[PDB]
Design a protein around this ligand. Sequence first.
Ligand SMILES: CCCc1cc(=O)n2nc(NCc3cc(-c4ccncc4)ccc3Cl)nc2[nH]1
Ligand SMILES: [Zn+2]
Length: 348
Amino acid sequence: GASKLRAVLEKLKLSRDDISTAAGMVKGVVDHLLLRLKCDSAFRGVGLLNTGSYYEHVKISAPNEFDVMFKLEVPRIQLEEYSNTRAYYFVKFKNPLSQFLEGEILSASKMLSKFRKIIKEEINDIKDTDVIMKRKRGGSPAVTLLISEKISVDITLALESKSSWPASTQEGLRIQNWLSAKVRKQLRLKPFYLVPKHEETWRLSFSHIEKEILNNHGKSKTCCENKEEKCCRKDCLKLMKYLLEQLKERFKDKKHLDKFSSYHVKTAFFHVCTQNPQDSQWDRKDLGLCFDNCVTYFLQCLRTEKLENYFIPEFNLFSSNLIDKRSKEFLTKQIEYERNNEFPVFDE
Ligand SMILES: CCCc1cc(=O)n2nc(NCc3cc(-c4ccncc4)ccc3Cl)nc2[nH]1
Ligand SMILES: [Zn+2]
């Protein structure tokens, strides 16, 4: 019941000071890397993007894995969609990145190739810390570093565009009944970001918007600022991420749930905030019912084989192109069992 979930949340708090130390280790390495990068002409205007709850730039993703985004101010960007994918684009210009231009197009692989070299150079140069360097399979996390042989950080290069959001997002960010039309208009005036994921295509990124709507998450502007308005939205997201983490830990050898990530969990959770816009639907005292709402919607997404991207609704995260049908059935079976029996996975 709800007291079992509160105990899970209390136990997760116990690792708060360990996560803070690990994040501080990441911050020191990133800040060193930021210094060098600003010496290269192509990356002269690089800075850290405000995406996480540690300082402002280190984003927790899993127990000992962090995410960091370097933003690059790039003006006069023109986008051309790569064939009805809605998510992927070529980058044009109507400048420092001239070396990576092939025709009128900006090569993500050439820009990404130099980025890696500089970081790989500077990782070796100064070692008052044990820092190594991996290449994760997908190029969306551009570089992965391993600090003290425990902490891993994904570093992502992103182009910053101050232009109006692409037309594929016109029907996304469906927050009007929850956070208001005024807030939706404000958010869409902010920049958007382009990260090199696979041709030489770029994918849109809204990491800065996720942080904003997580930390300013109520219908009431004073949600969670006083004892009378304590909701459980953040705790429900934490429990959902931890549920997936704990289930994945049971299949270390086979990696049966390898295709599922906290990105999927977060997407479903923000759809549930859309569906349940009132702060009274997230009363802290209703933790058990609210968590059930989140789990039940996730199950529905698994069974209908459909999880819409929060910003580009025509992009289905759960299409069989991306996640095998049998993988979705397997996770459906695991979660359905956990829900029907009060989440034994959380038992001590
Ligand atoms: C606030 C809700 C969660 C969220 C945060 C965020 O920063 N973003 N950024 C986009 N961009 C659009 C997009 C992203 C991905 C993706 C695939 C894999 N890892 C990352 C992103 C795949 C397809 C598409 Cl269309 N969506 C989101 N959702
Ligand atoms: Zn709140």
